[PDB]
């Protein structure tokens, strides 16, 4: 039947549904081969080591069964599909603009995970280190996107800074040094976080600090500018404890991503570098020592203006509390990018400032932290502003989605904790 063929009247729901199948089948068999090819590979890896130690035949056929014990569980995994109702919600924890964050127990077993809820079609964009929150796996549905992370009961640094309103130079030295070491590590993996800020900073069971993210898919960008162009009633330290209070009671949820802690050269063109995140550190350091961030303003545009003319907008109040090495550090972190501390082969050029003489930077993780969260269970939301606002103008109103066809390697690591 030496024949031929042509398009014309396959109604574009069965035209491009063939472009999909061709893609599906190639990636399929390409991978069915890879899978089997490593299935084989690691099997013969253990069998070259069971006869590399002169072991008993009872022993090898326990190790060998332990191997396939694993192997079987893997294929059991990919077969798994889950959604909600495989999770039970405990309490709501936070809200960004895109979606909230949830303390979750998995009905299936029952653990403490962190659920981050997000929104496809609204985020356009069209590993394993002590210092950053652990992401395990993720699964999708029709409208939102779901991520599974360990839950940090320490609250956030924003929520800390409220409860204490002011850190000492010793509290702060600790928490700063912690941030350096988190930030250092992120940079060493060739990333810039570009979203360092109080609420983006998290506390574990032992009062220690870790980052939560890396600055890929958190949020938005800045409008690059805009233009607007009487009896006083104020006492001016109160003046911020007044404005700030409006930047959480009506801005934590449905946030904007406040420009404090945003270094200057970002509002300019794309011209920035790893140094970008050290500014925000100095921003932060300032905040906990003084009582607000350096450029805190009535409105965020005003804040833009200050950062841009920062050389005359940075001033330390007359509430003394700040040594000659504290004040120096913030200043050498809150300057021009190519000049800033931690720019020149830095990130430990910071550690050598005389505001530390710090711990060996080794034992730092083993040390009594200024506040160990006093916890009452494994589901203690006590450290969270568990008040509820719940206004997300998405409202689309009224076991799908196989969560993984992963690789073996991620199966081990995620099994070695889950």
């Amino acid at each position: 039947m030496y024949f031929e063929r042509r398009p014309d009247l396959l109604t574009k729901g069965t035209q491009d549904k063939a472009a999909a199948v061709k893609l599906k089948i190639e990636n399929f068999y390409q991978s069915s081969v890879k899978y089997a090819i490593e299935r084989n590979e690691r099997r013969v890896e253990l069998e070259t080591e069971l006869t590399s130690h002169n072991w008993s035949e009872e022993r090898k056929s326990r190790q060998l069964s332990s191997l396939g014990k694993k192997e079987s569980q893997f294929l059991r995994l990919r077969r798994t599909r889950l959604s909600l109702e495989d999770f039970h919600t405990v309490k709501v924890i936070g809200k960004g603009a895109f979606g909230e964050v949830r303390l979750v127990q998995k009905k299936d077993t029952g653990k403490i995970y962190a659920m981050k809820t997000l929104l496809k079609s609204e985020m356009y964009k069209k590993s394993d280190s002590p210092w950053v929150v652990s992401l395990y796996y993720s699964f999708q549905d029709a409208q939102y996107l779901y991520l599974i992370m360990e839950f940090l009961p320490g609250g956030d640094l924003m929520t800390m800074l409220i409860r204490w309103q002011l850190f000492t130079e010793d509290v702060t030295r600790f928490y700063m040094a912690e941030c350096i070491l988190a930030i250092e590590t992120i940079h060493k993996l060739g990333f810039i976080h570009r979203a360092i800020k109080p609420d983006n900073i998290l506390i574990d069971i032992r009062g220690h600090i870790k980052l939560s993210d890396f600055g890929l898919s958190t949020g938005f960008h800045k409008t690059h500018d805009s233009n607007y162009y009487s009896i006083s009633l104020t006492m001016s330290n109160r003046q911020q404890i007044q404005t700030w209070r409006k930047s959480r009671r009506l801005m934590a949820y449905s946030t904007v991503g406040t420009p404090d802690y945003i270094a200057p050269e970002i509002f300019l063109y794309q011209g920035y570098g790893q140094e970008c995140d050290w500014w925000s550190l100095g921003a932060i350091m300032y905040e906990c020592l003084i009582g607000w961030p350096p450029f805190c303003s009535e409105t965020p545009q005003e804040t833009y203006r200050k950062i841009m003319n920062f050389e005359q907008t940075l001033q330390f109040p007359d509430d003394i509390h700040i040594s000659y090495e504290a004040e120096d550090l913030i200043r050498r972190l809150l300057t021009h990018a190519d000049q800033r501390l931690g720019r020149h082969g830095g990130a430990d050029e910071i550690k050598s400032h005389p505001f530390f003489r710090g711990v060996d930077w080794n034992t730092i993780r083993q040390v009594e932290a200024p506040y160990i969260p006093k916890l009452s269970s494994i589901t203690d939301t006590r450290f969270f502003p568990t008040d509820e606002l719940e206004n997300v103008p998405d409202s689309p109103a009224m076991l799908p989605f196989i969560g993984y066809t992963y690789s073996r390697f991620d199966y081990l690591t995620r099994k070695n904790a889950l």
């Binding site: 010793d170 509290v171 030295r173 600790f174 710090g358 711990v359 200024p370």
Partner: peptide, 5 residues
């Protein structure tokens, strides 16, 4: 209280 040198 706390002290971190």
């Amino acid at each position: 209280d706390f002290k971190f040198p």
